[PDB]
Amino acid sequence: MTPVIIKNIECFITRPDRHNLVTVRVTTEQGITGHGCATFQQRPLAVKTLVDEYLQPLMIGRDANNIEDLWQMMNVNAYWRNGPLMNNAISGVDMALWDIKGQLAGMPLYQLFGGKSRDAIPAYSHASGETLEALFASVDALIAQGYRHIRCQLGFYGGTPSALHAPDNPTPGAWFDQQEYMSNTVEMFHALREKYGWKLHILHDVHERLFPQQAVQLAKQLEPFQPYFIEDILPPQQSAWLEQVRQQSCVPLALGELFNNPAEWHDLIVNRRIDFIRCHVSQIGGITPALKLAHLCQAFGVRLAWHGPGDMTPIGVAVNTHLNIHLHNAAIQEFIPRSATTNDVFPGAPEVKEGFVYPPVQPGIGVGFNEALALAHPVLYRPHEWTQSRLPDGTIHTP
Amino acid sequence: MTPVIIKNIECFITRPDRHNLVTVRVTTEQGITGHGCATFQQRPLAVKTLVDEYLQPLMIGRDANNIEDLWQMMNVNAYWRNGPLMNNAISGVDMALWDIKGQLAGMPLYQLFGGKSRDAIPAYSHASGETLEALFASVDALIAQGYRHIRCQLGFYGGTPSALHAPDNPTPGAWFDQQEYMSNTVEMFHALREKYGWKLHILHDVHERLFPQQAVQLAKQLEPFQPYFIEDILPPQQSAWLEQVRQQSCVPLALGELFNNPAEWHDLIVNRRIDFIRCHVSQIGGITPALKLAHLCQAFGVRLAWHGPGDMTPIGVAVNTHLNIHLHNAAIQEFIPRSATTNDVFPGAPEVKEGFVYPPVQPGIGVGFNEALALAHPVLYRPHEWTQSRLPDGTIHTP
Amino acid sequence: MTPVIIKNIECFITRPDRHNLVTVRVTTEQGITGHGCATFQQRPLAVKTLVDEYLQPLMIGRDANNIEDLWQMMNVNAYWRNGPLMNNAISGVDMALWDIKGQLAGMPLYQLFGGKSRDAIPAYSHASGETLEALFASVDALIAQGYRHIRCQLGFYGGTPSALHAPDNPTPGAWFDQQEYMSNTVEMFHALREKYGWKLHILHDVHERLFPQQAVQLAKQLEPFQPYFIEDILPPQQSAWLEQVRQQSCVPLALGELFNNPAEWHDLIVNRRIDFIRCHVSQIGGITPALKLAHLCQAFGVRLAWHGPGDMTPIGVAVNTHLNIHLHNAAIQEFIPRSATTNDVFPGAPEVKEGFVYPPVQPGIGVGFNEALALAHPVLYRPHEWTQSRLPDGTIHTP
Amino acid sequence: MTPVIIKNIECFITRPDRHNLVTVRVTTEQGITGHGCATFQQRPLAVKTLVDEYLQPLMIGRDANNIEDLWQMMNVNAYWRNGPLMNNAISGVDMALWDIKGQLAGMPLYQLFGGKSRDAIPAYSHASGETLEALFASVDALIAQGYRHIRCQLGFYGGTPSALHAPDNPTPGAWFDQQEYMSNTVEMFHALREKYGWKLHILHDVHERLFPQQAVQLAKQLEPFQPYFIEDILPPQQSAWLEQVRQQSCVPLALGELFNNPAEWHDLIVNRRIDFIRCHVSQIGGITPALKLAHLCQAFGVRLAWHGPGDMTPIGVAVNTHLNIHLHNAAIQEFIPRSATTNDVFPGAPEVKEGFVYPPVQPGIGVGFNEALALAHPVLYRPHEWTQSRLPDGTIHTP
Ligand SMILES: [Cl-]
Ligand SMILES: [Cl-]
Ligand SMILES: [Cl-]
Ligand SMILES: [Cl-]
Ligand SMILES: [Cl-]
Ligand SMILES: [Cl-]
Ligand SMILES: [Cl-]
Ligand SMILES: [Cl-]
Ligand SMILES: [Cl-]
Ligand SMILES: [Cl-]
Ligand SMILES: [Mg+2]
Ligand SMILES: [Mg+2]
Ligand SMILES: [Mg+2]
Ligand SMILES: [Mg+2]
């Protein structure tokens, strides 16, 4: 085995469908090309600045074989470290180097890690509706596709202040009522169990909409309906309050899509305050740290449910899958279907078949990047008005 | 009082001396201009991308008076949040908004907060030398300047691997030996006490050079010499080990210049694991969060020593001072002297006089920004080779 | 900005309605007058003695700009410190000094702090009745006024011992039966949910009527009815028992109107034993310490519901509002309507409009003091017989 | 036994020597008169306001026999409670009622409690000097009087800012240097042991002069010299830091003269963070609560050293003595000698004989109050400039 020398590092932003996606391409003197995900959809241009202006000049000429040293070196390179942007930039490169290693080995990524610990990972997808009739139709469509796990939301939260009892001269934002959200959610589970029975796995994402006592209360109220998990019941800065949620309820708890600093997960895992970890692999710095995190989780009996939104390249989807097929403590793959155009730009990403995602068969990650087609779909500025989440008195809440 | 409407938000990178500095300028329809610090010296272009491409379009047209709502809104605006880039971008705007409020009030910033807690804040600066003779000359100069607090380092750490017993074919980086660093530091404190006696306040920055047991050992070894503080004895990710340092030594402990996420400081403050907090105000999101942090520290008897390196605009220096004059638990201001050119680009920043920094007298922050002189001193790419810190076997260490 | 020199400090006791109110007036050589609340209704003459005999001679001639130094100095000035009288005296002066700073800045108080966090603060008020019919009429009136949050009490507790099974020769006092109080309160919540449904926010003040196990039991019994909070479930000296309440119930818990020493709140906040803090701002030493407390609460996810009874000047009402508009973690403003005469003596205080209190617009606190009308309504001695609270065997209980 | 009916309650302020002393006289219809201490020397007129305007009208006509009910009733009577003033007012009355009970029983107070648990209590007094020669003379005089326990201070702390390296335009106050205080104290113990040897019991009062790490450091530095106790090493609000002091040093710790709220002592005692409790009996509400506190202390092996300054009536001195002769866990009586005039106003108080204070022999407290002579010595306003304690940068410190 000889040094595999990094020739260039490029970053592309492409919007084939709804989201600005960020891809890193690492090329080598040997002609082996790797691709990675660096998608932070809300701040893509800054991710590109980091790759083009900093990581490129740092990395060219180095030996790609040594992913571990390179990860450790990149991680501390700006002295100050961690955070959504820093971690996403590194992730793109880290994933791309693992892709290269897979190709050089002639093995799918998960086979490098040590191979399968299951025949396929279960998947869930998203169901929603403003009314029960609409929600039911959404659930019915996913059941017809063969999903056994479905994440369900009733109602939509965050519109005009005039839709509730707001103050005079309200500040613009996405306004909602936590009480309405809570009671609608409880009613939703009850109606879902009445219609669909007790075998369907029902997930629900609270999406940090609540104050600590509200989370405690909601957890107790949803317990009779046996959710598969209740996700992001609290924002990361209030995670100590999970101790009280645990004192009051046995609902499975999932948390962590927002994490981008190890200080956020350490005490959570060590005190067994969650059942499933939800980290976005690119937010935590890529495959290298995800493997260590998965093992830390295993030692405390915590299971894996990595974040798999539409705001992620199919490269990222594929990486979740490799991790899910290999790691013994993996539980479930959140999965959002992709457009034809998205598949054309990034060919080769896993698909769900009757609620399961199977082991990938190509060497490395197994997802390409059609640069020419990526040009046809440039970055578009989006306001993301939902992040300006306001309570009924106009208070900003964690969105 | 009437709404003060944001007209524009600009970001400038300027290098009047050694460091790439980043400054945010907020202009208003009313013609009141504010300036803030967003200096993350190792990644300035990315900070600029964030301000120009994201915060500018978000913020134009909003009422500048409501700093608290705007801080809360900006903080969660990209959903993912915290981290060095995101926080520095918001800092720039937050500081500029406080600058505007002081001007509108006709009061120095610290008078807005509720006015003075002290007549002047003590200051320290940096002394170093590769030999004791060199260190002594450097210390003598600062004593002649009237400093009563001096941060001292003996030797320099991070050069060619051929200076150590390194392996064959060593990887490039800044190589050092922890054992050499430790014994030189112990020798240094002994020699400084022999030469200068026991009234001089002597500070020392470990700069995360050590593994946990080494930190414990060094703290015990330095105890007899009564340091004013021992700073960054452990990297953020090993801060739990401060429990062991506390069990073994009464040395004062300072930590936190690296912080950019509240999960890094919460448990350390609550468990009284530090005596001084060292946060870089722009790294934690500006004045707004620094006030709340200062008050959280107060409730636990923790004192303040905000980061004040050369890699910070004089705007940042001034803000440290305002905070230091007001906050009852402020302890000391790290101070690094500035060149004529730096002062010309950012006129009005505080100066140290016989070891003290005095209350500013102008309204707002009291620091301007000479745009034309700034444009004459553009950004320069720097490799920052010291961040590639390697131990005697080649291992990356936290730099 | 120039020194603003304290010319005099005066204290007035006035009873425009039902309660003895205490107000501090700070006059300056510059002619800017500030007013503060020092209302401890049960001991007003002693507050006046403190201000007239001690704080006046201490304070005359000092620079009013430096609120922080003056607060710290006054706080420790008698060596012994804290407690209801000492803190109310200092509050009066502290608030008046903040009033002065707002006027000097030309800004409403909350704008000094950094401006708005919300468009308006929600408000609640008090409903009561000895029968359900009476309670319902009282609740209906507040709902017609636009309140969405109502604090409800069924029955009255504390009368002649002959109404209970009391011992022969009972000692005079306000006698009550905890079992009667508990069962009536449970009955009340059930009846209110049957009548008004599940959107109405219903608050209930236990007012330290119970022993520890009774508090635990009542919290569990009230859980199904989803109270907005249950307040003062335990007296300050038994607050450790909140650990047991938490183990047994998810009801929201409010505490702290009785606090006047930081040792009362520290452990309760740090251990997340409350959801809302209820401190009377003047009882904790004024605006200066209330800001630090609000921020300490914030770090632990505790929300604010400052005490707002009729025994507080409208100056105090206004200060609650300024704090409530600014502080991000403020939740609700307890509001009691004021007579024409009260408004005439203290003009400018906030009014509730359809369940909201809005940002004040005048500089400073925005509340004046009609001295001549104040002198027309002098102090009246009151026995406050309810503070002599006795159980069915004659035992004094915390009232 | 028949009801003993309270006829009047009076309060006198008298200054026979250096301090404003406060005495409460309770007269009865039966003609048995009791006296109590309510001395809060820094705020005497407010104590008198409380007694004359509030406790007098509350208490007349009640049965004095029932001290426990009356204590409990007075304690909660203003709803808000605890604090130096409230507690001192109640103490005066409480002590006076115990005095009456003693007289009615024909027994010295300590005999009511259950009699002696020692033949005499050891005493200490205060030695001081600016220089060692002066300190030694002071110690020599106390040794010649037969003291075996002596509280020693070297140097005086708190004078003009020009005596140290203070900032320009220093704020008036009592300025000192914690470093100077610390090193002088260490030198003092060393020199005391060299001169006097190792049998003399040496006490030292830190008087909350230090920051937490300074306390930890000083505790370690004084350990070799085997102090009898080190008193008030930390202010009450930083008492959690005693955990670190305990981790680092075996010096006996004494704390509590400042206490006037049970929240201040509870966690301290329960976690065995002190060896001696130092409460001022009148600050904690008199004999009734002191007895309960002493028993709480006993269950955790904490010993008693009640505060016995010159700012206490000889009635208070006598009460300390009764408590000290009876309570098994009493350790030592701080004692400051009294002038002829002081003894003439309050005849009958205990004296020290060869380092011991003996059991009192008269019924009740055994100390009278000569009202006519008390007139010859009225209240005098004093500034107490030492409470305005400033550090070298001008910061207020707990005095
Ligand atoms: Cl970042
Ligand atoms: Cl809604
Ligand atoms: Cl486990
Ligand atoms: Cl503390
Ligand atoms: Cl300078
Ligand atoms: Cl929290
Ligand atoms: Cl009103
Ligand atoms: Cl008091
Ligand atoms: Cl001194
Ligand atoms: Cl024990
Ligand atoms: Mg989610
Ligand atoms: Mg440092
Ligand atoms: Mg209440
Ligand atoms: Mg003392």
Side-chain angles (χ1 to χ4, degrees), chain A residues 151-338:
Chain A
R151 184 233 63 166
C152 299
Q153 182 182 313
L154 174 65
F156 295 111
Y157 305 98
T160 75
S162 64
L164 52 135
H165 299 285
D168 292 339
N169 305 299
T171 296
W175 291 61
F176 82 109
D177 184 334
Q178 292 155 319
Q179 191 189 53
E180 174 86 6
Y181 157 78
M182 284 169 74
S183 56
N184 284 344
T185 300
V186 173
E187 289 162 18
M188 177 197 70
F189 271 92
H190 178 94
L192 285 174
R193 288 302 182 205
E194 288 296 314
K195 181 169 170 72
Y196 298 106
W198 293 84
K199 294 231 316 147
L200 181 62
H201 301 288
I202 306 171
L203 296 70
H204 175 82
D205 196 345
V206 177
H207 213 274
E208 61 179 7
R209 279 175 194 105
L210 303 178
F211 291 114
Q213 183 279 331
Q214 288 171 340
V216 176
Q217 185 178 317
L218 186 62
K220 295 193 82 172
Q221 285 193 271
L222 303 179
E223 190 185 287
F225 309 111
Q226 303 175 355
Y228 177 88
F229 65 56
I230 295 301
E231 179 188 345
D232 285 18
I233 209 174
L234 291 161
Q237 270 187 75
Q238 289 170 176
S239 67
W241 286 92
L242 294 172
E243 183 167 6
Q244 287 175 33
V245 177
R246 286 305 210 196
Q247 271 175 14
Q248 289 294 317
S249 178
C250 67
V251 296
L253 301 167
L255 208 94
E257 79 190 49
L258 277 167
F259 292 171
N260 42 47
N261 192 305
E264 293 172 318
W265 65 68
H266 181 88
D267 282 347
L268 176 78
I269 295 166
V270 182
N271 287 289
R272 294 166 181 93
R273 297 267 156 75
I274 56 172
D275 302 290
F276 308 80
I277 192 66
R278 291 280 293 143
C279 299
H280 196 111
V281 175
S282 79
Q283 285 281 331
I284 69 169
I287 287 163
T288 296
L291 289 171
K292 303 189 174 84
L293 180 54
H295 293 154
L296 168 67
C297 285
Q298 198 283 146
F300 292 84
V302 177
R303 286 174 276 163
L304 313 174
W306 308 111
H307 194 205
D311 56 299
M312 178 177 57
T313 61
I315 298 160
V317 174
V319 167
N320 282 359
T321 297
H322 285 285
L323 291 160
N324 289 339
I325 299 299
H326 166 71
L327 296 157
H328 186 255
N329 62 327
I332 198 162
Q333 180 162 350
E334 175 176 27
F335 192 99
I336 297 298
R338 313 185 289 273

Side-chain angles (χ1 to χ4, degrees), chain A residues 99-121:
Chain A
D99 194 16
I100 288 157
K101 192 177 281 295
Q103 291 173 68
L104 187 53
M107 294 182 178
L109 179 52
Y110 82 91
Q111 283 294 338
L112 291 177
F113 299 155
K116 281 163 37 165
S117 57
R118 63 186 40 80
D119 294 311
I121 191 72

Side-chain angles (χ1 to χ4, degrees), chain B residues 120 122 146-149 199 353-356 358, chain D residues 160-168 170 175-177 179 391-394:
Chain B
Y147 278 100
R148 271 70 191 179
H149 298 77
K199 289 189 46 69
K353 181 198 172 163
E354 308 280 354
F356 284 118
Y358 285 83
Chain D
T160 75
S162 64
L164 52 135
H165 299 285
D168 292 339
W175 291 61
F176 82 109
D177 184 334
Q179 191 189 53
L391 304 173
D393 66 345

